Amino acid sequence: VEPNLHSLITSTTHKWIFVGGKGGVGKTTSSCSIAIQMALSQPNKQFLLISTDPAHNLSDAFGEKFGKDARKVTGMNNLSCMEIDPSAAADLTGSIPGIDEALSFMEVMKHIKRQEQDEGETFDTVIFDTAPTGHTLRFLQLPNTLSKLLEKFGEITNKLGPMLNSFMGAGNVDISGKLNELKANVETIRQQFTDPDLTTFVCVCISEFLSLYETERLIQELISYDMDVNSIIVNQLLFAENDQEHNCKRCQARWKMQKKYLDQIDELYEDFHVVKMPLCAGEIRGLNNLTKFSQFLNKEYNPITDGKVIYEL
Amino acid sequence: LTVEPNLHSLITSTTHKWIFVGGKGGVGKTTSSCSIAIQMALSQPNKQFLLISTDPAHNLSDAFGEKFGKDARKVTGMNNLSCMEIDPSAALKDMNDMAVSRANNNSLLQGGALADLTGSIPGIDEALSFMEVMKHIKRQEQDEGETFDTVIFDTAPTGHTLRFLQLPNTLSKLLEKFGDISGKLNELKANVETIRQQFTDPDLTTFVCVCISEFLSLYETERLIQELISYDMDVNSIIVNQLLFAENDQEHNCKRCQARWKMQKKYLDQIDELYEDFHVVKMPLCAGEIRGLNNLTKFSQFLNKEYNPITDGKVIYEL
Ligand SMILES: Nc1ncnc2c1ncn2[C@@H]1O[C@H](COP(=O)(O)OP(=O)(O)O)[C@@H](O)[C@H]1O
Numbered sequence: 096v097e098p099n100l101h102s103l104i105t106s107t108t109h110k111w112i113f114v115g116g117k118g119g120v121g122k123t124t125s126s127c128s129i130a131i132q133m134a135l136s137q138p139n140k141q142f143l144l145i146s147t148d149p150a151h152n153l154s155d156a157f158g159e160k161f162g163k164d165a166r167k168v169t170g171m172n173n174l175s176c177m178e179i180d181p182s183a184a185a186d187l188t189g190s191i192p193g194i195d196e197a198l199s200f201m202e203v204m205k206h207i208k209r210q211e212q213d214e215g216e217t218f219d220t221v222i223f224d225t226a227p228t229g230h231t232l233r234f235l236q237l238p239n240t241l242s243k244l245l246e247k248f249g250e251i252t253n254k255l256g257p258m259l260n261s262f263m264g265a266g267n268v269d270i271s272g273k274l275n276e277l278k279a280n281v282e283t284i285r286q287q288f289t290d291p292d293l294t295t296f297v298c299v300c301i302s303e304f305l306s307l308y309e310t311e312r313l314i315q316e317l318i319s320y321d322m323d324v325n326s327i328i329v330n331q332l333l334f335a336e337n338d339q340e341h342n343c344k345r346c347q348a349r350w351k352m353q354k355k356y357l358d359q360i361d362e363l364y365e366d367f368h369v370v371k372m373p374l375c376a377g378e379i380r381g382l383n384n385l386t387k388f389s390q391f392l393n394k395e396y397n398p399i400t401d402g403k404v405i406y407e408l
Numbered sequence: 409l410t411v412e413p414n415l416h417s418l419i420t421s422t423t424h425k426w427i428f429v430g431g432k433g434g435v436g437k438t439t440s441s442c443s444i445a446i447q448m449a450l451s452q453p454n455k456q457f458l459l460i461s462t463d464p465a466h467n468l469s470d471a472f473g474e475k476f477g478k479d480a481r482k483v484t485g486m487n488n489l490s491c492m493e494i495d496p497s498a499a500l501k502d503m504n505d506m507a508v509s510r511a512n513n514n515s516l517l518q519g520g521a522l523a524d525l526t527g528s529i530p531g532i533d534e535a536l537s538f539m540e541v542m543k544h545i546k547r548q549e550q551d552e553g554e555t556f557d558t559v560i561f562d563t564a565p566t567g568h569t570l571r572f573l574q575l576p577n578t579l580s581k582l583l584e585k586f587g588d589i590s591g592k593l594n595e596l597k598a599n600v601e602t603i604r605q606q607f608t609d610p611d612l613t614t615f616v617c618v619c620i621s622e623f624l625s626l627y628e629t630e631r632l633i634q635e636l637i638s639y640d641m642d643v644n645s646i647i648v649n650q651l652l653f654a655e656n657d658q659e660h661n662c663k664r665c666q667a668r669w670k671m672q673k674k675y676l677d678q679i680d681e682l683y684e685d686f687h688v689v690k691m692p693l694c695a696g697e698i699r700g701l702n703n704l705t706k707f708s709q710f711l712n713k714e715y716n717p718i719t720d721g722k723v724i725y726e727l
């Protein structure tokens with residue numbers, strides 16, 4: 096398998112791509128890069144990079160101001176960003192898992208469709224800059240979670256007397272109707288997010304123990320949801336050997352370790368697209384630098400020859 | 409009054425008997441164990457110390473440059489510090505395997521198999537694994553006739569070594585529902601509780617966490633402190649290892665590192681604001697590996713007297 100995201104960046108079948116990665120690994124940068132890279136290689140289509148981080152990371156990343164309303168990235172023709180707070184814009188929430196996530200997510204699916212209605216321009220693909228916390232998409236399990244719970248009720252409600260059942264008189268069947276109407280919304284989405292050719296998740300990690308462990312946990316969690324996981328980007332690698340030996344033993348030391356774990360990553364995820372990305376000089380901000388960086392998601396970086404490219408950054 | 413940023417009062421203590429040292433990730437769990445152990449022993453010549461490990465990798469041996477095993481052995485060059493590396497899970501299998509042999513052809517709490525509920529009731533495996541450890545210790549204290557005044561536990565790299573602290577309350581809950589095996593369960597729930605009486609006393613036993621100043625280690629560390637609180641174990645000291653005070657301008661020729669430092673600092677301030685009440689001891693990143701009694705003790709020194717990146721620079725660069 097090829098050490099890059101070329102086939103995805105190039106894909107004409109995907110409509111929903113997720114980009115996650117806990118810890119300060121490069122989740123946002125990778126989102127933008129994937130987004131830019133895809134947009135640039137398919138001028139014919141339209142792209143939407145949406146975030147949820149209240150911190151307004153996409154704004155800080157590109158050097159522009161985005162909000163609840165889609166706005167093309169200054170300098171691009173088909174890449175638009177959108178930063179929303181789903182939580183900001185019914186209380187079994189603190190009892191049944193995935194109910195708040197399912198609702199919070201549906202809220203996102205609405206700001207998108209409505210933005211597609213006003214600008215009359217529908218997005219061909221949406222790159223999801225997953226929120227830095229919680230479990231954004233546990234809701235994929237809501238359907239099976241509700242089926243089991245509305246079977247506990249049917250087991251008790253059928254094994255009792257008219258008295259007991261007709262005794263409890265709650266304003267909960269206004270609930271009975273909306274839990275099934277939701278259990279339907281989720282499942283229609285699940286038929287989408289569960290199709291390998293339609294949506295995939297891209298993990299981001301640094302080459303260190305805690306991040307490999309954390310990203311391993313993520314892949315497990317994503318499999319349990321039936322979400323497709325086939326690509327992981329190992330960011331902030333510092334190929335210190337090819338580094339024209341800029342001295343510093345402290346770094347040569349770090350590199351030896353990253354290499355030790357790249358080997359594990361390599362042996363543990365042989366079937367995945369394990370993309371190696373260089374550690375740049377400073378922050379990677381603005382469309383220009385983001386583009387220059389994003390290029391190595393498509394054609395694997397060469398620490399020997401492409402060195403001169405990330406040092407002009 | 410500020411809580412000193414060091415382990416002086418612990419290393420100095422004459423009240424503690426059980427000290428645990430944990431830290432997931434390659435943060436410095438082993439090195440800190442050795443250091444705490446050495447520093448304690450050096451500060452209290454009058455007493456005897458045992459640094460036990462469970463890591464099958466024999467980390468204490470690789471750490472000191474000697475060979476330790478199931479039998480305590482004083483650290484060459486020390487008078488009151490002895491190490492021992494054992495595999496409690498292994499010895500628990502050899503003990504169980506043979507209990508099954510003596511069942512067919514018929515820790516007394518093994519007759520047949522009290523260990524089958526292991527994959528059912530949480531803490532049973534750990535409670536047994538741990539008692540196995542308390543045995544090799546008492547046994548070693550019986551033969552060499554010299555009992556240890558304090559044991560530093562180099563927690564094992566994985567699992568949940570001391571979840572068993574919950575076993576008592578977990579069995580009482582189960583014993584009420586289900587109300588041979590029943591005699592072994594209670595005989596166990598008594599062993600654990602007499603231990604909790606010990607491990608639950610702040611003046612008798614404490615746990616010291618180890619972490620590097622990065623996001624995942626801080627949260628991992630938080631996770632641990634929560635877990636240890638849930639067990640009623642004392643947690644008052646966190647060792648933030650591998651810090652590189654890059655600002656010292658000494659060899660600061662590197663920017664890449666200056667970058668790393670800015671980050672560590674970012675989290676040191678969180679660790680400092682989140683654990684104000686704790687003893688948050690800052691340890692320097694050395695040049696290379698810290699191995700052997702000599703370098704291990706030179707380093708360990710900064711667990712007692714907080715390190716000074718300006719003054720003490722000359723000390724960590726001789727290693
Ligand atoms: N590979 C890299 N090399 C150099 N700098 C990077 C790299 N990746 C990210 N950065 C910089 O570090 C910061 C890390 O945050 P970011 O990329 O947004 O990830 P996350 O979503 O985890 O916060 C960014 O502001 C960016 O400018």
Ligand SMILES: Nc1ncnc2c1ncn2[C@@H]1O[C@H](COP(=O)(O)OP(=O)(O)O)[C@@H](O)[C@H]1O
Pocket residue numbers: 431433434435436437438439440467649650651691692693694695696697698699
């Ligand atoms: N502060 C430090 N400076 C330089 N090297 C260190 C430091 N702390 C630990 N090391 C070295 O890093 C490696 C990490 O392993 P170790 O210290 O045994 O911890 P752990 O039990 O978490 O693996 C060892 O080779 C160790 O000697």
Ligand SMILES: [Zn+2]
Pocket residue numbers: 343344345346662663664665666
């Ligand atoms: Zn450096």
